[PDB]
Amino acid sequence: GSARELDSTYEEKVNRNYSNSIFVGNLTYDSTPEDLTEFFSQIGKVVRADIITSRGHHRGMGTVEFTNSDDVDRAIRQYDGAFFMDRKIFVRQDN
């Protein structure tokens, strides 16, 4: 008896839960740590951003540090793909 039957199951889960830091590899080479600070820190608190270097070789990439280990990811969910001075930032987590 019966025909065309089916079955499936689902769950919610997370991984790699550690650190308080983030990296950005495709932003504008004119960006300052202050430009990333006023951007990211609307979520809560950036404690440090970094982009400018003493050698200055046109790098186009930098780092940001938060007070948080989960809301720091909830930031990126709203900012990865941001066209930023016409040039699209893309984010990588710490490790």
What's the CATH number where 70 sits? 3.30.70.330
Technique behind the model = NMR
25 secondary structure, DSSP code: S
- Yes or no: say if 30 and 17 are a contact pair by the CB < 8 Å rule: no
Distances in whole angstroms, Cα of residue 54 to Cα of each of 24, 30, 39, 94: 19, 15, 24, 23
C-alpha 28: how far from chain center: 15
How many domains are contained in the chain?
1
* Cβ-proximal residues to 50 (8 Å cutoff; 6+ apart), any chain: 33, 62, 63, 64
Q: Which domain holds residue 19?
A: 1-95
Please state, in angstroms and rounded to a whole number, the distance separating the CA atoms of residues 73 and 22.
9
Q: What share of the chain is helix, strand, coil (3-state, %, to 5)?
A: 20, 20, 60
